[PDB]
Amino acid sequence: PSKVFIGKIPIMLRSTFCILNGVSDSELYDLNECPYDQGGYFIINGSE
Amino acid sequence: MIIPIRCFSCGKVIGDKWDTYLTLLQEDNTEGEALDKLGLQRYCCRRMILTHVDLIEKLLCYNP
């Protein structure tokens, strides 16, 4: 094939394919997050 | 964040009376009623240690 890049798609926090998903509470802090956040939002251009 | 210290209505100090409070409702099998053993006859302020949220253990773990 060719595996070529085609623009970029903004991910939604706490998803099946997010950077967190299966992360334990004790490890959410290390990352400066909050065990209460329930995702739902996008952080495009720096703002929710 | 941490007990208020000095109840809202009276002056009765409550900064002292928590390091000892929590060591009963989860460490002596006494009731919410146990605070009565801390000189809390008034409403009053005694709804101070009771209606409180320990928001610092869960805030302190953000180390710079």
Swiss-Prot record, chain A:
Superkingdom of the source species: Eukaryota
Localization per record: Nucleus
Function field: DNA-dependent RNA polymerase catalyzes the transcription of DNA into RNA using the four ribonucleoside triphosphates as substrates. Second largest component of RNA polymerase II which synthesizes mRNA precursors and many functional non-coding RNAs. Proposed to contribute to the polymerase catalytic activity and forms the polymerase active center together with the largest subunit. Pol II is the central component of the basal RNA polymerase II transcription machinery. It is composed of mobile elements that move relative to each other.
Family: Belongs to the RNA polymerase beta chain family.
Other comments on record: The binding of ribonucleoside triphosphate to the RNA polymerase II transcribing complex probably involves a two-step mechanism. The initial binding seems to occur at the entry (E) site and involves a magnesium ion coordinated by three conserved aspartate residues of the two largest RNA Pol II subunits.
Subunit and interaction comment: Component of the RNA polymerase II (Pol II) complex consisting of 12 subunits.
Protein name, as recorded: DNA-directed RNA polymerase II subunit RPB2
Organism, scientific name: Schizosaccharomyces pombe (strain 972 / ATCC 24843)
Lineage: Eukaryota, Fungi, Dikarya, Ascomycota, Taphrinomycotina
Gene name tied to this protein: rpb2
Residue span relative to the full protein: 147 to 194 of 1210
From Swiss-Prot, chain B:
InterPro entries found in the cross-reference section: RNA_pol_su_RPB10 (IPR023580), RNA_pol_suN_Zn-BS (IPR020789), RPABC5/Rpb10 (IPR000268)
Gene3D superfamilies xref list: Homeodomain-like
Annotated compartments: Nucleus
One Pfam match: RNA_pol_N
Gene Ontology molecular functions: DNA binding; DNA-directed RNA polymerase activity; zinc ion binding
Keywords: DNA-directed RNA polymerase, Metal-binding, Nucleus, Transcription, Zinc
Gene Ontology biological-process entries: transcription by RNA polymerase I; transcription by RNA polymerase II; transcription by RNA polymerase III; transcription elongation by RNA polymerase I; transcription initiation at RNA polymerase II promoter; tRNA transcription by RNA polymerase III
Sequence positions that bind Zn(2+): C7, C10, C44, C45
Main location: nucleus
GO cellular component: cytosol; nucleolus; nucleus; RNA polymerase I complex; RNA polymerase II, core complex; RNA polymerase II, holoenzyme; RNA polymerase III complex
Subunit structure: Component of the RNA polymerase I (Pol I), RNA polymerase II (Pol II) and RNA polymerase III (Pol III) complexes consisting of 14, 12 and 17 subunits, respectively.
NCBIfam families: PRK04016.1
Family to which the UniProt record says this protein belongs: Belongs to the archaeal Rpo10/eukaryotic RPB10 RNA polymerase subunit family.
Function: DNA-dependent RNA polymerase catalyzes the transcription of DNA into RNA using the four ribonucleoside triphosphates as substrates. Common component of RNA polymerases I, II and III which synthesize ribosomal RNA precursors, mRNA precursors and many functional non-coding RNAs, and a small RNAs, such as 5S rRNA and tRNAs, respectively. Pol II is the central component of the basal RNA polymerase II transcription machinery. Pols are composed of mobile elements that move relative to each other. In Pol II, RBP10 is part of the core element with the central large cleft.
HAMAP family linked to this entry: RNApol_arch_Rpo10
Name of the protein in question: DNA-directed RNA polymerases I, II, and III subunit RPABC5
Natural source organism: Schizosaccharomyces pombe (strain 972 / ATCC 24843) (Fission yeast)
Name of the gene encoding the protein in the UniProt record: rpb10
